[PDB]
Amino acid sequence: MLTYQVKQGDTLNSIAADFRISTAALLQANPSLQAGLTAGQSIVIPGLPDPYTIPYHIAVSIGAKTLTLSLNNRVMKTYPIAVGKILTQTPTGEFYIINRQRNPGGPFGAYWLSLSAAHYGIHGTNNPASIGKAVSKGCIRMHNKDVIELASIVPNGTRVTINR
Amino acid sequence: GMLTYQVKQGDTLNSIAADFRISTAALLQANPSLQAGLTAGQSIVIPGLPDPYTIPYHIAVSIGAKTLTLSLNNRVMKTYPIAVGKILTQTPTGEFYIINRQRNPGGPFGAYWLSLSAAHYGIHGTNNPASIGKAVSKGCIRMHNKDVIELASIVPNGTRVTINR
Ligand SMILES: [Cl-]
Ligand SMILES: [Cl-]
């Protein structure tokens, strides 16, 4: 099961928001939390497949404006993306796909895939000219046809590694 | 004066820069000591903004009440209905500041966007007035367009925004 290391400053609700779960679910999965939330301790995040057995991996290059989908550490597809503006960048680091919603429409296009950072995700677009540019509030945007392909394949729990 | 931020473990130059909508160059320039490392608990300067404690306005947001209250010199002057984040994508709680603003961004953001000191979060208008008063957003605070215009025309960047469950 997916684990998370508690950081100084974390709260039950800040963690819940990153992982798109209720505090009820968070507490149910972690009886230890009754004793208090303490930095350095590990907790389990409910609602996800075991990420260790997921053969898919997503790698994002902010600099190259590309997203690669790999299966068994070999590349299946490569897509161009939009990324965050220079003052509102897409964050670098290690994330997970948490959930997805079909056809959110509007600026989100054909799919929204939640990333394990509050408010961040991978989604479609109503604005094709934005793809390939640093123009977003921080999300990764793809052409609708591409995010549909991506969502149709990858399970929740899939790792998303974002690099410069 | 200058606004200050207290570093927490896990913070990076980039994460802080994203929260305060500044470049890492600006952050570093204002804090020459950071090159030697970030330590939890240290206070750093955030350029481009005044001392928030010099601004006489204070905004209080209640997620429960679905209200944003504006105070001046610790007197309540106006209260507005707001939309807040859905249960799985809640509005974050704590102490924030208004960081910058953009007039008439349009789309779901309506007549105004005010950035809050958490990356991707802000107070903004809406092209969906029915949503105001409900827990329906990805995490932002939404107001009626006329309300966010009014709020934005009163309060300056750096204004303290306290968000309570
Ligand atoms: Cl968004
Ligand atoms: Cl937004």
Side-chain angles (χ1 to χ4, degrees):
Chain A
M1 191 140 60
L2 193 150
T3 57
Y4 172 80
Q5 182 172 312
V6 179
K7 293 156 66 175
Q8 293 172 5
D10 280 354
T11 66
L12 295 171
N13 279 282
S14 74
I15 294 171
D18 278 349
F19 292 101
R20 311 299 200 286
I21 55 180
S22 64
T23 47
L26 181 55
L27 294 169
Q28 272 272 42
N30 295 282
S32 65
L33 287 175
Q34 288 307 302
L37 189 57
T38 39
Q41 297 296 71
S42 176
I43 65 179
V44 291
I45 304 300
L48 296 171
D50 204 15
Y52 166 72
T53 179
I54 301 178
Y56 296 100
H57 180 250
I58 294 171
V60 171
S61 173
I62 299 174
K65 286 147 181 53
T66 56
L67 177 157
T68 296
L69 174 58
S70 298
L71 180 280
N72 299 132
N73 300 312
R74 297 290 188 177
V75 176
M76 300 203 295
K77 248 297 180 66
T78 304
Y79 307 100
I81 60 177
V83 296
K85 307 186 75 71
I86 208 176
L87 286 183
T88 64
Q89 298 184 33
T90 300
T92 62
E94 300 287 357
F95 305 96
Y96 303 88
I97 300 294
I98 296 303
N99 62 43
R100 80 285 312 285
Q101 296 83 57
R102 184 171 56 87
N103 282 316
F108 307 118
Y111 267 97
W112 167 283
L113 295 146
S114 293
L115 291 168
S116 55
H119 211 322
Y120 288 83
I122 296 163
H123 62 80
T125 188
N126 57 344
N127 191 27
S130 76
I131 304 304
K133 304 179 183 291
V135 59
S136 87
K137 284 185 176 297
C139 278
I140 292 154
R141 311 181 178 171
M142 316 173 68
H143 293 290
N144 283 349
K145 68 178 180 187
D146 295 341
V147 75
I148 290 170
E149 281 194 1
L150 187 60
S152 293
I153 298 176
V154 306
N156 301 332
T158 294
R159 281 191 188 268
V160 179
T161 302
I162 307 182
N163 320 275
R164 290 308 188 90
Chain B
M2 299 171 290
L3 185 148
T4 65
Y5 171 73
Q6 184 174 77
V7 174
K8 64 183 185 295
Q9 272 299 325
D11 283 348
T12 61
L13 292 179
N14 272 111
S15 79
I16 295 178
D19 279 342
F20 290 95
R21 316 300 204 279
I22 57 176
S23 67
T24 59
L27 182 62
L28 279 171
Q29 174 175 67
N31 300 279
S33 72
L34 288 181
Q35 201 196 353
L38 270 64
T39 296
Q42 85 177 92
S43 279
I44 67 173
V45 167
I46 304 297
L49 300 148
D51 191 340
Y53 301 105
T54 54
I55 292 167
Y57 293 105
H58 190 165
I59 294 159
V61 174
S62 168
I63 292 173
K66 262 59 160 190
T67 58
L68 182 153
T69 303
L70 176 63
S71 292
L72 172 58
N73 293 316
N74 277 314
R75 182 180 317 292
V76 170
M77 60 175 295
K78 237 302 178 61
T79 310
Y80 306 98
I82 63 178
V84 296
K86 284 189 177 183
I87 200 60
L88 294 180
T89 64
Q90 282 204 302
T91 295
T93 60
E95 303 287 6
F96 306 89
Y97 313 97
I98 295 175
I99 294 312
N100 64 36
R101 66 193 56 206
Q102 242 302 322
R103 191 182 324 281
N104 201 31
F109 308 116
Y112 240 107
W113 169 277
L114 315 174
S115 293
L116 292 169
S117 55
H120 215 324
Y121 291 90
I123 303 164
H124 65 81
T126 186
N127 59 349
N128 184 13
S131 79
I132 305 302
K134 293 172 172 295
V136 63
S137 83
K138 282 191 179 293
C140 278
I141 296 162
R142 306 180 185 174
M143 309 183 65
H144 288 286
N145 285 332
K146 298 307 183 178
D147 282 344
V148 67
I149 294 176
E150 180 184 301
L151 178 66
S153 297
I154 293 176
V155 306
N157 294 338
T159 295
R160 287 188 290 150
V161 173
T162 303
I163 307 173
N164 272 22
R165 192 159 307 284

